[model samples]
Target: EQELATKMLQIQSKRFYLDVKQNRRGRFIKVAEIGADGRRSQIYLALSTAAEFRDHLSSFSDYYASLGPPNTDNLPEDGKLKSEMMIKDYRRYYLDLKENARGRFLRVSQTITRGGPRSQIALPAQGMIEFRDALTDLLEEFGAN
Candidate 1:
């Protein structure tokens, strides 16, 4: 639960706190917005998505470090490379391989026939191998024990 970095800023009466935080296998950003009355709302983004978002945001200000503008061409698909679903006890999981202007990545989500807190996570396609290995490592250890 360590915050690698944090900052606070304000838009008149609205205060915004941005945090770069880390937890096992996680390095993500949190955006927390608070009104002068302490009303709050927040959201989180992984590092990869955060970087792509920043790139897209640059379009609003007209700047680029990359060769050309965001190459938003060739979106001629369901954007779904593959998909699968499985059930485990009261829970269900979805494995989706999808693509967008940000290129390929996996989007996984879960639900419960007992659905309380819906959970989801996404990782870039290139990181899939590492992600799978990490899961397999846990599987192997737990399977033996």
Candidate 2:
């Protein structure tokens, strides 16, 4: 019994492990939620869940870093886009939420979209609806029960 339990633990540990790899595809996550403060309208969020949010923010991030940080000549200065400060904050927030259900879902979404741009791949309306439904399921499963 002891040996079987030890082997099961090892198998589970091996099943859930993450490590940095060279030539990894950089992808970002943009999340929007629909419920807050009893508001009827939805909101859009540009968020990330990677262990290194900045490094994996986009294929653009990898390309930009490869060519060095883009200035006015190379890329537009978009105020609403991810900034270095946002990257740092996201990394901290993602790490803090790493052990939670919402975090796991976001991480799964990020992994699924690696090597692509969120704008090119994300369907905000559909995704937001799906996210709300998923949260509802979770709440039913574990909220105030």
Candidate 3:
């Protein structure tokens, strides 16, 4: 039980912190989540902070908080994940990737988050693979904000 709570907090913390990172650009610069195909998931981008990324995070927090505050030092359940948890995890993962991605003449479709394996796709950058790997490795884990 204790371990599960810790892991949940870790994921939640990462999500919350990274979501803030995505929103720090302030107004005028929007963060977008668009999809070329209507049926496909929307890809996130910075456009005008139109919806105010903070609002999105607030919604997430309102619901997650209703569930209960996860223990900061406990680990999450191992193996398969619950549906809502998976949704939260992926949403954060992609956002974190976008928050740090940096590219020059790199197409979004060819970026790391969309470039390879599902796991690698969670990377936060569109720069050279080596640089992205190095950065992600050095700063993979951070406590809740």
Per-model TM-score, in order, reads 0.46, 0.20, 0.23
Candidate order by lDDT, decreasing, is: 1, 2, 3
In the order shown, the candidates' Cα RMSDs to the true structure are 12.8, 18.7, 17.8
Candidate 1: lDDT of 143? Answer: 25
How far off is residue 103 in model 3, in Å?
Answer: 31
Q: Candidate 3: global Cα-lDDT?
A: 0.24
lDDT of 1: 0.52
Query: Where does candidate 1 clash, by residue pair?
Result: 112-115
Backbone clash total for model 1 is 1
Model 2, global lDDT: 0.25
lDDT of each: 0.52, 0.25, 0.24
User: lDDT score, residue 39, model 1?
Assistant: 70
Per-residue lDDT over 1-145 for candidate 1, one digit per residue giving the tens place of the 0 to 100 score: 8876665655435565657787896666665666446676655655554443333333322221222433456543776645666555565656566667755555556677866766655544544443333333333332232
Q: Write the per-residue lDDT of candidate 3 for residues 25-125, one digit (tens) a residue.
A: 33121112222232222233222221323333343334333544334534334311111211221232222211211211111221243334332112122
Q: Provide the lDDT at 13 for model 1.
A: 51
True lDDT of residue 13, candidate 2: 13
Q: Candidate 3: where is the Cα deviation over 4 Å?
A: 1-44, 48-52, 71-145
- Candidate 2: give the clashing pairs: none
